[PDB]
Design a protein around this ligand. Structure first.
Ligand SMILES: *CC(=O)N[C@H](C)c1cccc(Cl)c1
Ligand SMILES: *CC(=O)N[C@H](C)c1cccc(Cl)c1
Lengths: 304, 304
């Protein structure tokens, strides 16, 4: 029992983190097999960041200009290519600690673990959600760029996020591992507003089922609702519209707890219309939306 | 920028987790050098748990009764001793992945990272505080026993917690790595209430300095207070009394932010007397007490 904002064990990813220096810019790279993946802005000076031509900037760079250090041993670069907003640096050595891995583009509302790094050294791990507006609310200082997000299915690490920049608003933007930004963002130090962020409705309901399983039930009410009725409320409170797909995905928690999905929606409806009344749910004074239905099942069954 | 409940990278500890089976009981062990540390209740049947004689129960057990498996390779046991509430199993092989490590007893209000394991397999990592009443609010299912808490200073892993049991209230109790329970708890399935838990005042103030650094300042007020005056409020709201030792430890955040400690206390005083007014601080709708002053400095400077 107990429910915690739980990250994946970060070992398999620690063994991949390297330092990439080009000119005077250092940031983090991901060494998998004989390739080091890093943000392409490693090639720029903070001056270039205002409107960089990455084609033109990269032409000035050779394999030998890219200094790749795993701990206290240098990797020899035999190839460099730009893919969207990442550089791939071919090294002559396959990383001996390469885990089973995939590159996956996550959907908004999905969660993943971030291993924050500085100079290719891990400092910490935390669990995130891809916001509906394709930002993440991370903890990322200067030199944190190239830090990756991931999920782990038994032995396989699915890389889903590489950290690129911090918006003026204090939120974080980055790419999948094929260098494609999540959201409308570009690797340039410019005006870039994120859209309206919504709350991830299916995650809040998931987290409400985690509460009931873990003893917190004060918010279970006598009421039910309809998808339609509940979505009028979700609209009013800038919550994602709930679909049958969201209902289907909540079935296991519905079945385990015996509380119909639309009954738990009715619970969420009253919580949104009436607030918490100074109470807490799983030690939170607001509605948590950064646990998926898969995250609640995993943590409420003990999957390693 | 951004502030997150951040765990230590768990790799160094993953490489230590083994499975320990005695009779039909499986739980997690910690393999460091040629010793596997685990909870002594591995030797019991859930029947024994009601009033176990561990001296008597352990006499019936031989080195060969302790089955120790690191992944898919068995460790040969050449010695067994009981120390307080842990067994130490001498194995014939030193763990090749033994990190630099110390055993440390933490003080209440200190934080650490927990690597939750099932059958010696890591499932997740999260950041905890030792509650003033020496409980922790973890996420620990059946078979989670032997899961360890830790801090990491560069390369050195300080082991501070081994998970033993879940109280009837849903909170968690365990030992240091010399097998001494934190709190008045015994490894027996009995009535055991925890004391009054308090809120860790110095941690809340620490977290308020993390807010100001990270942009959230709406709670800075025109007022100051005295240790004495503030402690009358702390009493009323079941907060730890604040000492000069707590003030000294907050100096770096006071200096970095230019906000005197007693001014931030005055901030906390009004927050306690007047609540949040439906607002949030670093995405929390209550006062967080599970970041230390050392935790705020580390995450607000980028220490790996
Ligand atoms: C990680 C980071 O923020 N790197 C530099 C400072 C940066 C600024 C603007 C845009 C981009 Cl992609 C990167
Ligand atoms: C981890 C755990 O809870 N193990 C068993 C179930 C247990 C019950 C009561 C007391 C103790 Cl020490 C352990």
């Amino acid at each position: 029992s107990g429910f915690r904002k739980m990250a994946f064990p970060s070992g398999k990813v620690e063994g991949c983190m390297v330092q990439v220096t080009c000119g005077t810019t250092t940031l983090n790279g991901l060494w998998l097999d004989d390739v080091v993946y890093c943000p392409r802005h490693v090639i720029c000076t903070s001056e270039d960041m205002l409107n960089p031509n990455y084609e033109d900037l990269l032409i000035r760079k050779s394999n030998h200009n890219f200094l790749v250090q795993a701990g206290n041993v240098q990797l020899r670069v035999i190839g460099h290519s730009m893919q969207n907003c990442v550089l791939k640096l071919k090294v002559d050595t396959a990383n001996p600690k390469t885990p089973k891995y995939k590159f996956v583009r996550i959907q908004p509302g999905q969660t993943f673990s971030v291993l924050a790094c500085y100079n290719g050294s891990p400092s910490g791990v935390y669990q995130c959600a891809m916001r509906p507006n394709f930002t993440i609310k991370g903890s990322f200082l200067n030199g944190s760029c190239g830090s990756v997000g991931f999920n782990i299915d038994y032995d396989c690490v699915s890389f889903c996020y590489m950290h690129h920049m911090e918006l003026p608003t204090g939120v974080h933007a980055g790419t999948d591992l094929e260098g494609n930004f999540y959201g409308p963002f570009v690797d340039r130090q410019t005006a870039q507003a994120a859209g309206t962020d919504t709350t991830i409705t299916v995650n809040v309901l998931a987290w409400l089922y985690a509460a009931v399983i873990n003893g917190d039930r004060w918010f279970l009410n006598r009421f039910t609702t309809t998808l339609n009725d509940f979505n009028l409320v979700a609209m009013k409170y800038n919550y994602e519209p709930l679909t049958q797909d969201h209902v289907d995905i909540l079935g296991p928690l519905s079945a385990q707890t015996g509380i119909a999905v639309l009954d738990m929606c009715a619970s969420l409806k009253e919580l949104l219309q009436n607030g918490m009344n100074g109470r807490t749910i799983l030690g939170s004074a607001l509605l948590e939306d950064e646990f998926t239905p898969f995250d609640v099942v995993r943590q409420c069954s003990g999957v390693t």
